[PDB]
Ligand SMILES: COc1cc2cc(c1Cl)N(C)C(=O)C[C@H](OC(=O)C(C)C)[C@]1(C)O[C@H]1[C@@H](C)[C@@H]1C[C@@](O)(NC(=O)O1)[C@H](OC)/C=C\C=C(\C)C2
Ligand SMILES: Nc1nc2c(ncn2[C@@H]2O[C@H](COP(=O)(O)OP(=O)(O)OP(=O)(O)O)[C@@H](O)[C@H]2O)c(=O)[nH]1
């Protein structure tokens with residue numbers, strides 16, 4: 001059992017969903033029509049990949065996923081795309097009018113019209129579960145749906161499913177691909193509203209991903225397609241422990257124990273390696289030591305920040321492919337005597353390690369080289385607060401003049417919600433500061 | 441110890457229910473507050489437009505009392 | 508889909524309105540019969556935004572043609588793409604405004620406005636999801652100006668949760684010898700600042716100066732001025748008409764362009780009148796603005812820029828960054844990342860590549876000050892006040908409209924002077 005239900009909200013959530021589920025299918029040998037030849041138990045099973053796929057009597061493996069967007073044109077492409085047979089039509093939910101980069105419309109005006117239908121379809125997946133573990137929620141910070149509707153959904157999910165675990169993959173805005181001037185507003189509002197209702201959230205800085213595509217894959221002007229294929233690899237690495245089995249395999253929930261010292265401190269920093277082109281990977285093998293050392297190059301992080309100027313509260317290494325503990329231990333011992341790695345004084349310094357022997361996979365016609373071994377580091381660093389600081393500053397610049405605020409007030413919101421949300425962010429920045437101070 | 445064991449699991453149930461309860465109530469209040477505000481904004485808009493109509497009547501009226 | 512309902516009022520409105528439909532019908536590859544004869548599926552993916560699809564694959568403009576005189580109505584129907592418009596959507600009076608704002612707004616137009624609304628309503632109710640309305644008109648006349656602003660108020664009563672966009676043509680003595688135009692403009696602006704969400708300020712002063720000084724066309728015809736208008740209107744709707752990420756609809760445009768509700772008057776720009784670098788330098792040049800304002804006399808609140816044609820998108824990103832850095836003083840710092848760049852790889856007709864500009868600049872006040880200068884002098888003179896009071900208007904409605912436009916100017920000045928700290 002231990003089923004996980006994925007919920008993809010808004011354009012960013014949906015399109016990243018497309019990348020992830022395409023990638024999962026290739027990893028598990030699932031065809032676009034949903035058939036899986038290697039799977040001999042027809043109509044059901046207790047295998048590890050069943051945490052993410054349900055099975056029909058006809059042998060179809062169906063994603064435990066819901067796609068939601070307040071406008072139809074993004075999900076329509078799924079309905080008519082390569083993997084359209086993969087999803088039951090009821091898993092793909094669309095309204096007629098989007099939130100127009102407005103949190104208020106996503107949470108209230110437009111969102112309230114479809115929220116009940118969404119919860120009903122989610123309920124239908126959950127009742128098929130024999131032991132539901134929790135939810136994985138994909139969304140942008142900047143969009144009106146990604147911000148507004150997500151926070152509404154997360155609130156409602158806490159009511160309907162109690163303390164059942166809820167994880168986030170949140171797309172943090174970058175100006176190179178930004179769509180709205182008000183994305184700082186939407187970011188602060190959804191972060192404030194979802195904070196109590198999320199157990200663990202993996203932020204993905206679009207600029208971090210943008211830079212990696214430019215620097216490591218030599219993509220002059222990365223598209224969402226370039227970004228999402230890279231993002232899906234990090235997501236795959238994180239969910240791999242749920243979808244595969246193995247002796248040295250460590251469940252994501254075990255890492256979670258280490259990553260979250262306090263409820264509000266639940267934002268791990270992700271760092272992935274190797275990201276390399278076919279051209280460069282040719283006749284060049286990246287060893288365990290090399291990819292592990294790459295995890296401490298800030299250029300490889302999913303979020304722009306400097307952990308070297310912060311303190312660690314946890315360090316997890318999630319390997320996949322040709323990797324054995326001996327090489328990991330050797331690589332770690334080398335790194336600790338050469339990197340700027342400093343822990344807070346109230347936490348142990350040991351690195352927690354997981355290994356999935358299933359090697360990395362790449363999507364056809366993709367920019368990433370196929371490698372024998374990869375690693376995703378999940379660390380809890382005070383430095384990730386830098387991402388909050390940058391967003392909060394941009395928020396302050398506009399809110400001081402109340403720029404664009406009338407678009408929110410016009411949809412029923414009050415200025416008190418802005419100030420309340422900003423105060424919570426200030427407390428959160430202070431929290432990350434407090435945990436880094438030495439004990440008395 | 442048996443009694444303490446009961447009190448601990450009862451506390452966990454209580455706090456879990458209290459969280460569900462306060463979330464349900466906090467949300468219902470927000471959607472209600474938002475419904476009132478948005479309606480009040482639209483209502484104020486129509487009222488201003490509806491006195492533009494009353495003004496136009498007064499103008500056409502003023503033209504008939506012009507002759 | 509997300510439909511826009513187009514409305515054109517008065518002579519100016521119908522002139523530029525017709526040319527607008529001629530240009531985009533060509534871009535979307537449909538002939539004056541309404542049949543499609545294109546080559547790219549991208550032409551039809553978002554065709555329903557402006558067109559109704561009829562039986563036999565016939566695309567009909569979602570357009571409503573209005574005027575208080577039946578003259579122009581025959582012009583359109585006889586002009587090219589005249590047989591594509593819906594016959595029932597022609598709504599004409601017989602009287603004619605004669606450049607009297609009061610007649611268009613309170614008298615003659617108020618008696619034709621309902622039969623216009625009936626057509627608006629019929630088009631609207633057949634929309635899968637109406638996003639809003641766009642109006643083409645001048646502010647110097649009587650019909651397009653006075654009745655156009657009446658229709659806006661009336662439409663906003665029945666569709667208050669929709670976006671109201673306008674292409675307003677501003678009066679200039681360099682083009683029209685009519686003397687009362689600054690009355691009509693001020694009275695209109697009094698209405699537009701309250702009841703529209705987005706207004707494209709098409710300034711005849713700017714259109715004239717471009718034709719005369721850059722295109723070197725002494726004695727410029729309305730055809731010359733409208734060639735600029737059509738190219739502009741094509742540019743600022745590209746994001747609405749073709750598959751895109753940025754300002755793909757009227758509401759998302761408004762949210763990105765309007766930081767304060769009253770400050771919704773944009774000065775558009777167009778280039779050329781090439782290399783990616785000087786395309787960018789031109790579109791930010793005062794000579795290429797369709798509003799007679801110097802952007803370096805104020806600060807940009809927000810900016811939207813679309814480049815069209817096949818070009819290096821890396822180069823466009825670099826140069827848009829370049830312009831913001833070299834001209835950092837002319838973008839307000841209390842709005843981070845206020846400049847947005849779009850790219851459509853299908854160019855306009857005739858050009859291999861072009862660039863359209865939409866700026867919300869505090870320098871727009873230069874345009875309102877020009878009108879106000881004429882208006883205030885006319886108000887003291889009291890020249891031709893009887894034609895307005897003759898329809899039942901009061902002298903205060905002139906005063907109120909004046910001071911409201913004065914407020915708009917000072918409000919644009921307020922945020923121009925504002926600092927981060
Ligand atoms: C002998 O001297 C002159 C004689 C006339 C005009 C002028 C001079 Cl000096 N000047 C200065 C002007 O600037 C022209 C302008 O009119 C124009 O729009 C244009 C048609 C000329 C106007 C009057 O200010 C405009 C509105 C008050 C308008 C006028 C009208 O159109 N109807 C109406 O209700 O209001 C009307 O009847 C149809 C015809 C035209 C008027 C007459 C008075 C000529
Ligand atoms: N990485 C990545 N980011 C995306 C993608 N699509 C959109 N974004 C980002 O998401 C933000 C905009 O939010 P969207 O998800 O597009 O908007 P939305 O969720 O549909 O909400 P609406 O306003 O109602 O459309 C911007 O910062 C974009 O850069 C994507 O496919 N991949």
Ligand SMILES: Nc1nc2c(ncn2[C@@H]2O[C@H](COP(=O)(O)OP(=O)(O)OP(=O)(O)O)[C@@H](O)[C@H]2O)c(=O)[nH]1
Nearest residue numbers: 517518519522604605606645647648649650651683
């Ligand atoms: N750019 C441009 N301006 C025009 C055009 N036609 C008229 N105008 C301007 O419009 C202003 C007067 O408004 P009109 O549209 O002509 O008059 P109307 O709105 O039809 O109202 P009435 O004529 O009184 O019934 C003048 O300042 C003209 O310069 C045009 O084709 N192009």
Ligand SMILES: [Ca+2]
Nearest residue numbers: 039041044045
């Ligand atoms: Ca099975």
Ligand SMILES: [Mg+2]
Nearest residue numbers: 010011071098
């Ligand atoms: Mg969307």
Ligand SMILES: [Mg+2]
Nearest residue numbers: 517518576650
């Ligand atoms: Mg006329």
